[PDB]
Symmetry: C3
């Protein structure tokens, strides 16, 4: 026998419910991954279900024996498999087969056999739970002894209802592996045919916890929030002040005589212990109903101002005695507060509160002239005046308010007198005086411990305090009403209650496809604290990343483990916080670096130094904007009530909630329609692109529609479309079909490329594209001569620029991130809404039809109401989230409409609004629930450092360029436009005179020639 | 502008009308609940209405 | 900017102060409710606080 690792074994079918092609997260008893497995006639203890994998060829393993003693005293399970049928018996046997036709079953005993049953790499999960021995058998007869580290689910062979206790078990002979199960959480991937092809644990590795969190087997590169770490309490102290043992109850409860219901005694108890178990059997009183504070918990923080009330009543009188009750007893004998936090004890008292002939002394206040209030006693016994005239005795309705009770021992059970003790105590006053005994402990000394200070219970770190408690204050809180200081009278030392350290943990992963290594960030914690918690086995996320050297880093965000800090600087890849970012580098590992804010570039400013570009670039940049959202209509009745009139009637009493939700959803839908209307339908007439499509070298094929395909979309539109992507919820189709939206886009683009921007200001005015582009250069401070002088090149500069766009949308799969995020957000909202239909919301069941066919309608009303409230809050949350998302998408659609008005129907002078550079033109392209703008921008390049001067002094007067800039290449001076180096000989045509040569700071002598 | 005014008016009208919704309780008026039942169960009914 | 900071602080302060709201239950602390009532009855109070 040795020790091996259970690689991926032990996965069985948790239930007999079919599921196909899903990723179901289930918590159950399993064999944890990579657990330690014993590979072997010892008596193996039965740790709540075992995984027994027998590998054999001689059929030596003839079965199993289970039990607690296995010695013919307690019931033991015998399983044997002889040659064809599995004999399963539940008997009480001393021994078994342990000492072809070489062996036979003789055993040693067969007493009280309560149950009988008959039917390589033999895997058997034996699970004892709920009176069931569940045997999950996988007999995959592998041909060969190679033990495969592979996957194989265990179908449930049998579920025997034997219902016996099993703590130990052995194997029966005529090798094998044993592993022990623990309660874990698994993600099972049920395949089409209904088979669990794979399972993922949720407690090994940070990676196989984010796999569970996202409910997927492949996570993407990124920081993932997950469960919250917390240092678990180390010890558990229970400190009280100096205590005394009196328990002055039984000597009172046993007493010969108590008082009447009107003459009751408020007995006060102080400075003792709550020895209340004696009242159950030592004074065996039967009626014990504790209201407000259920019994069997009466051992600490129990009583502060405990009072006892002694009542003597009949048998059929305790019923009227309850908090909030009314009646003559309540009216004039005694009245209870509604918030009675105490206990009522009643018991028959014939032999101790009655006379053998009958004791006519225990009377009651029949009438009284004072209304009773909580915790008040009736004393006055004068004649109850019932008339306006002074009423004394007979005459008016008045009578003596004291009637004798005939407490006879010959009366029936209903008339037998009851002695009653009412323990009324207030679990509030901070100073206490009575509860039971418990072990005390010294100061925790800076240790996260369960504290029980005088009833104040919690988990925290108790340290010396400098807060001056005046010698009457017991507790000490903060503005948040959190107790930040306590002092036990026994120690009389003021100590603060700073809580046990916690926060969250977040997993940095480079993606499952890339690698499997991960890093963990304990947010907001000192690395010393987390290392100490690691050492003394105190961190809740039991998976421990090995804290080797050069792998624990302390950032302002917290403690990062699993990645080394590098003093080099890089652009952020996986944001962490405080300016640190982690990434996978190359041997290959996760590193954390200070984020580098781009390169550092020192501009060479000088008194006279200017740089004018000598060349440029026609960049084309894609800008994606959501425009719409999936119009969803939810039927309130069907969602809340599954076509049940019984539920509909209850829903009808909740006001016009369904009407409000329907109104909000319809408003959202019409808003989506108006959004796409305003974004795409800004053109009055559908413009048709010309038959011949020569535009001075500008290609316009990937953006103009190509008729040789259905839906008449552009190839770029085709890539965009192919790249993106029940129970009362309906997805209403958009008013504008995708073909209509494509037609709007085609008309907009055709007007842009034929009539220029004129079609946005009125009638479309035809104009050749090489002239429109010259206008658009004039609109950015670049003279039109630049275009015609360099037309063809620019055309190619545009054409290649558009070509890469295809690859930018083809090679990169996350280009349409925003639109896919919108779609995924809507899908997640709908998925959560439908999944919460399966939530019980603290009711009997999540399905209405079960509750209908389970209970009478008056009782089913409560469950239906709880389900209605839960589902209605679900609907309200969904509708509010949809309204907020619709407002956000409305803002985005307003931005898109503004862009199409200014970036497409004209040229915008707003900087960095229609691209990154000097805007030239723009092109819209439809996309699922959005638009994509191909912002065409002029970007200067190929600089040239030059010498400049604000003014030229030719004829003793200053001279200034009319629109250009005075520059020089060392010797000659030229006036040139300030966005493209076009040197020109300085003359009065480009220069205007203003003033003389004594005011300009940096005027320069030169010649301004005459043309 | 008329739609804005109508939206505000409809919101206010819905708010006042929902004062008459029983919300799965005995009635929609606090005073009847108070002068119809004992204070303990009346507390639960008022809690539901609240 | 001070208004933004104060609004966030007020939101957090209200969120933590409503931890002391009884919400029509026995108390505002789960620990007392647990060690005062049996779990079947304490279920109602825990549900109300939740
Ligand atoms: C405009 O660009 C398109 C590319 O979309 C050019 O079409 C290419 O034409 C050549 C031959 O002329 C073919 O070899 C390519 O396969 C075509 N491209 C594609 C994607 O099929 C077109 O020639 C360009 N010019 C005009 C006037 O349309
Ligand atoms: C089962 O039997 C064992 C015998 O030692 C005992 O310790 C254990 O408490 C029993 N538990 C049950 C009844 O499941
Ligand atoms: C009184 O004390 C005796 C002692 O034997 C006990 O049997 C009896 O139950 C007690 N009765 C009460 C009411 O305390
Ligand atoms: C209460 O005091 C009265 C005084 O007469 C006495 O008769 C009665 O037995 C007492 N009841 C108790 C001890 O609760
Ligand atoms: C963490 O604890 C050590 C030792 O107490 C201390 O020196 C260090 O400053 C702490 N870290 C931070 C961020 O305060
Ligand atoms: C620019 O001229 C000022 C004149 O006061 C001088 O102080 C400064 O050094 C000059 N900058 C240069 C030469 O880079
Ligand atoms: C300008 O840059 C383009 C490419 O960006 C290049 O082909 C061309 O030769 C450069 N010079 C001129 C004068 O166009
Ligand atoms: C342009 O700036 C560089 C420094 O960045 C300088 O060396 C160079 O001389 C400048 N150009 C001219 C025309 O002097
Ligand atoms: C400056 O530009 C003029 C333009 O005519 C040219 O002749 C000259 O060679 C250039 N360089 C210098 C150093 O003047
Ligand atoms: C510019 O020229 C005028 C006349 O030729 C002269 O008086 C003045 O000093 C000159 N300035 C400089 C800076 O050379």
């Amino acid at each position: 026998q040795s020790y091996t690792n259970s690689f991926t074994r032990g996965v069985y079918y948790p239930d007999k419910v079919f599921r196909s092609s899903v990723l179901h997260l289930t918590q159950d008893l399993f064999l944890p991954f990579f657990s330690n497995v014993t590979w072997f006639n010892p008596v193996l203890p039965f740790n709540d279900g075992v995984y027994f994998a027998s590998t054999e060829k001689s059929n030596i393993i003839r079965g199993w024996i289970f039990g607690t003693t296995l010695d013919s005293k307690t019931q033991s399970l015998l399983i044997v498999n002889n040659a064809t049928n599995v004999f399963i018996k539940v008997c009480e046997f001393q021994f078994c087969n342990d000492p072809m036709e070489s062996e036979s079953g003789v055993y040693s005993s067969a007493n009280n056999c309560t149950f009988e049953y008959v039917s390589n790499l033999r895997e058997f999960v034996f699970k004892n739970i709920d009176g069931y021995f569940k045997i999950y058998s996988k007999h995959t007869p592998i041909i060969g002894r190679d033990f495969p580290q592979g996957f194989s689910a265990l179908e449930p062979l049998v579920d025997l209802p034997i219902g016996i206790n099993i703590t130990r078990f052995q194997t029966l002979l005529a090798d094998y592996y044993v592993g022990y199960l623990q309660p874990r959480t698994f993600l099972l991937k049920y395949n089409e045919n209904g088979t669990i092809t794979d399972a993922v644990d949720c407690a090994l590795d940070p990676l196989s916890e984010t796999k569970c969190t996202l409910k997927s087997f492949t996570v993407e590169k990124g920081i993932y929030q997950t469960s919250n770490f917390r240092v678990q309490p180390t010890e558990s102290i229970v400190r009280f002040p100096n205590v005394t043992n009196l328990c002055p109850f039984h000597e009172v409860f046993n007493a010969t005589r108590f008082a009447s219901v009107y003459a009751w005694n408020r007995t006060r108890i102080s400075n003792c212990v709550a020895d209340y178990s004696v009242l159950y059997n030592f004074a065996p009183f039967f009626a014990f109903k504790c209201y407000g504070v259920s019994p069997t918990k009466l051992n600490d923080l129990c009583f502060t101002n405990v009072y006892a009330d002694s009542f003597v009543i009949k048998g059929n009188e305790v019923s009227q005695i309850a908090p909030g009750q009314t009646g003559n007893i309540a009216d004039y004998n005694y009245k209870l507060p509604d918030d009675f936090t105490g206990c009522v004890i009643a018991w028959n008292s014939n032999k101790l509160d009655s006379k053998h002939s009958g004791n006519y002394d225990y009377w009651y206040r029949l009438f009284r002239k004072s209304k009773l209030k909580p915790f008040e006693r009736d004393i006055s016994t004068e004649i109850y005046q019932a008339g306006n005239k002074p009423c004394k005795g007979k005459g008016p309705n008045c009578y003596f308010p004291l009637q004798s009770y005939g407490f006879r021992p010959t009366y029936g059970v209903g008339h037998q007198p009851y002695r009653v003790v009412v323990l009324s105590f207030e679990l509030l006053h901070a100073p206490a005086t009575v509860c039971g005994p418990k072990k005390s402990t010294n100061l925790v000394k800076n240790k996260c411990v369960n504290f029980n200070f005088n009833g104040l219970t919690g988990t925290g770190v108790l340290t010396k305090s400098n807060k001056k408690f005046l010698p009457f204050q017991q507790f000490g809180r903060d503005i948040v009403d959190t107790t930040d200081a306590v002092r036990d009278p026994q120690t009389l030392e003021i100590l603060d209650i700073t809580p046990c350290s916690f926060g969250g943990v977040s997993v940095i992963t480079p993606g499952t496809n890339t690698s499997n290594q991960v890093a963990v960030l304990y947010q907001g914690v000192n690395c010393t604290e987390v290392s100490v918690a690691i050492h003394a086995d105190q961190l809740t996320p039991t998976w421990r990343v090995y804290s080797t050297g050069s792998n624990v880093f302390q950032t302002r965000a917290g403690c990062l483990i699993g990645a080394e800090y590098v003093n080099n600087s890089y652009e952020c890849d996986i944001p962490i916080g405080a300016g640190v970012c982690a990434s996978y580098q190359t041997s290959q590992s996760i590193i954390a670096y200070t984020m580098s804010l781009g390169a550092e570039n020192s501009v060479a400013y000088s008194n006279n130094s200017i740089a004018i570009p000598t060349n440029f670039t026609i960049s084309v940049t894609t800008e994606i904007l959501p425009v719409s959202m999936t119009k969803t209509s939810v039927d309130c009745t069907m969602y809340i009530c599954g076509d049940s009139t019984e539920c509909s009637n209850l829903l009808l009493q909740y006001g016009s909630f369904c009407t409000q939700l329907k109104r909000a959803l319809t408003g959202i839908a019409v808003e989506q329609d108006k959004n796409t209307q305003e974004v795409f339908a800004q053109v009055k007439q559908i413009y048709k692109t010309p038959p011949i499509k020569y535009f001075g070298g500008f290609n316009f094929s990937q953006i103009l529609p190509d008729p040789s395909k259905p839906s008449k979309r552009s190839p770029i539109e085709d890539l965009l479309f192919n790249k993106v992507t029940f129970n009362g919820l309906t997805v209403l189709p958009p008013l504008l079909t995708d073909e209509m939206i494509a037609q709007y886009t085609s008309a907009l683009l055709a007007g842009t490329i034929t009539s220029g921007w004129t079609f946005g200001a009125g009638p479309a005015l035809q104009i050749p594209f090489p002239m429109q582009m010259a206008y658009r250069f004039n609109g950015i401070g670049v003279t039109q001569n630049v275009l015609y002088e360099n037309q063809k090149l620019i055309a190619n500069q545009f054409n290649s620029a558009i070509g890469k766009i295809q690859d930018s949308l083809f090679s990169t799969p996350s280009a349409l991130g925003k639109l896919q995020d919108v779609v995924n957000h809507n899908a997640q909202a709908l998925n959560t809404l439908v999944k919460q239909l399966s939530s019980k919301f603290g009711a009997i069941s999540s399905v209405l039809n079960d509750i209908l066919s389970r209970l009478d309608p008056p009782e089913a009303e409560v469950q239906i109401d709880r389900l209605i409230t839960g589902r209605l809050q679900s609907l309200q949350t969904y509708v509010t989230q949809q309204l907020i998302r619709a407002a956000e998408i409305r803002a985005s659609a307003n931005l898109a409409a503004t862009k199409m008005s200014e970036c497409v129907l004209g040229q915008s002078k707003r900087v960095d609004f229609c691209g990154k550079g000097y805007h030239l033109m723009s092109f819209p392209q439809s996309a699922p629930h959005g638009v994509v703008f191909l912002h065409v921008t002029y970007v200067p390049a190929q600089e040239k450092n030059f010498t400049t001067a604000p003014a030229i002094c030719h004829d003793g007067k200053a001279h200034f360029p009319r629109e250009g800039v005075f520059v020089s290449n060392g010797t000659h001076w030229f006036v040139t436009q300030r966005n493209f180096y076009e040197p020109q000989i300085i003359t009065t045509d480009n220069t205007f005179v203003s003033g003389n040569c004594d005011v300009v700071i940096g005027i320069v002598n030169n010649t301004v020639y005459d043309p």
